[PDB]
Structure 1
């Protein structure tokens, strides 16, 4: 009741990933919660419902939605008479983050936004009036969104405009708002180039990118990831978006990004990664097994012909479906990272973090 019930695991997991949770999109957490939304703020409940159903996806979109929900929560916050805001607000936000984690494991951008908000709340003087503190917190969140995402995207687009050349063939993977904005602004400014969109099952997010590239008038080819080795002879540049950059330089991105980096290296093609500095992390990963997300295994079912293979796959005791979400590209496979600070080597992630931490 007071604690949200834990989400149930869907089915059998791969033995190498048995430490990670595996959830079903159909089984939502709101089945055993009060509809007037007492325990958890209604904005957080709606946000978690949108997370668990895949309605909101992408690092920037998830971070922005979380920050807006947190603004709504702060606006409706009343300090207890025998408590201080700096402690009570931080203590109150924790069950909300636990519920959001239960709905879907938090992205790196969401984690960094949560840390920033907690630091901002803690640094509120006890003498400040409640409404003044709430207005300051909302203004801080607005500034965070404006500077860490929007202005950062504009600066990254301006920096990446220099790398794109006339006659280039740029290979992009999946859906990334930063990459799409970079390509659209490069096309608008006068650069002429082709884009090859590589997509993969089951999300097929690359189609999103494809649609945008046609609305902007950019010529675009489309193919699946297994055919990448066929198309890379034509490709002159690979441009990838990153969900996170780890302290050791590794790029944590959608599964298959490291595959594309490896094949591009085998084909002697430069690989560039676009990421905002607000998504840099102090964690380190050496592989995709230690920390990852296991999506719904049922998404791996496909309709080929009349029959459906893998239908009722749980009836086979030895059959496991592995719907990996993320993967880790080692820094040796990445040639360049474009951030709002400029073009940096993949090994400059730890220093940038330091530069962004001495201020705070």
Structure 2
């Protein structure tokens, strides 16, 4: 009911598996919460969901979880209810939630078999951080039997890019763990950039691990392409104009951030399970997705 076990179940699930992303565990916790609601209303649920979201934004601050909660609460109330007895509402809403979580699950697979046709065999993937979606993109790019060298910058705030490097070279790919300060160097020999995404703001540029923006502009420096892969529930309706504009609950968690903003004029294309989008299209489909 209350956070006293809601939050514990959330953490247990989210940390049961690393391939299991965070905000999808948030969605699943909201669903089990509905499965243990024990109440008679809908308004009180339009408020109790927000309560669970605000107790979830503390255990995790990533734009992922806020996006997941908001978008799920939005879409769940889409098939016109016309309540019968606060029970038909229950069935139809849990059905909407099941359908949404399954869409979420297959988002990664869809973006996998949609992305793999972009690594021009014999190229240089330059990722930036351990990101399940980039990982299972490169997996389906080696399954279709291409070849490519992967530079994973190390993401100084926590040397976790090494985790991507290890789990990736587990798949027999030539990996090279560059210095994340060297993203001015290896950019001479990066045929494309595939950065994992943790949420997309409206205008198209995205919120990503600290070392993204620099890499981003480095791309636009040397006219390389910059590609992102944002899972389907990583949309938020912020709209920053400079790295300080993003909400402070997101950046922090001396003075050094953790996520920052890549302006849209640098991203060349986005790969979501909603297809392939020039950023203007992500503005459009974000408006018409939240509705």
1:276 Cα shift?
3.0
Distance change in 2, residues 1:97/1:195 (3 Å)? same
Secondary structure of 2:30's aligned partner: helix
1:48 Cα shift?
6.1
Instruction: Give the Cα–Cα distance (whole angstroms) in 2 for the partners of residues 89 and 99 of structure 1.
Output: 15
**Aligned twin of 1:245:** 200
1:349 to 268, 279, 282: 282
Given the alignment of the two structures, is residue 270 of structure 1 paired with residue 220 of structure 2, yes or no? Answer: no
Secondary structure of 1:136's aligned partner: helix
**Aligned twin of 1:47:** 10
Distance change in 2, residues 1:77/1:44 (3 Å)? same
Given the alignment of the two structures, is residue 279 of structure 1 paired with residue 234 of structure 2, yes or no? Answer: yes
User: How many residue pairs get matched?
Assistant: 288
Shifted more, 58-67 versus 218-227: the winner is 58-67
Gaps of 5+ in 2: none
- Do the aligned partners of 1:295 and 1:325 also contact (CA within 8 Å) in 2? yes
1:329 Cα shift?
0.7
**Aligned twin of 1:93:** 49
Instruction: Give the Cα–Cα distance (whole angstroms) in 2 for the partners of residues 173 and 47 of structure 1.
Output: 27
The equivalences for 1:282-301 within 5 A come to 282-290=237-245, 291-292=247-248, 293-295=250-252
1:72 Cα shift?
1.7
1:69 Cα shift?
1.2
- Do the aligned partners of 2:19 and 2:132 also contact (CA within 8 Å) in 1? no
The equivalences for 1:50-199 within 5 A come to 61-79=21-39, 84-117=40-73, 120=76, 124-128=81-85, 130=87, 132-147=88-103, 149-199=104-154
- C-alpha offsets along residues 304-351 of structure 1, whole Å, 9 cap, x if unaligned? xxxxxxxxxxxxxxxxx1231111111111111122233221222221
- Do the aligned partners of 2:125 and 2:149 also contact (CA within 8 Å) in 1? yes
Instruction: Give the Cα–Cα distance (whole angstroms) in 2 for the partners of residues 142 and 106 of structure 1.
Output: 23
Secondary structure of 1:170's aligned partner: strand
Secondary structure of 1:332's aligned partner: coil
1:328 to 231, 243, 261: 261
1:144 Cα shift?
1.1
Instruction: Give the Cα–Cα distance (whole angstroms) in 1 for the partners of residues 150 and 231 of structure 2.
Output: 22
- Do the aligned partners of 2:76 and 2:97 also contact (CA within 8 Å) in 1? no
1:95 Cα shift?
2.8
**Aligned twin of 1:305:** none
1:285 Cα shift?
0.6
Distance change in 2, residues 1:48/1:330 (3 Å)? same
**Considering only CA atoms, is the larger Rg found in Structure 1 or Structure 2?**
1
Instruction: Give the Cα–Cα distance (whole angstroms) in 2 for the partners of residues 266 and 119 of structure 1.
Output: 40
Gaps of 5+ in 1: 1-37, 297-320
The equivalences for 1:304-343 within 5 A come to 321-343=254-276
Instruction: Give the Cα–Cα distance (whole angstroms) in 2 for the partners of residues 339 and 119 of structure 1.
Output: 18
1:42 Cα shift?
1.1
**RMSD, matched Cα:** 2.7
Instruction: Give the Cα–Cα distance (whole angstroms) in 1 for the partners of residues 12 and 110 of structure 2.
Output: 33
Distance change in 2, residues 1:248/1:294 (3 Å)? closer
Tell me the TM-score normalised to structure 1 length.
0.72
**Aligned twin of 2:171:** 216
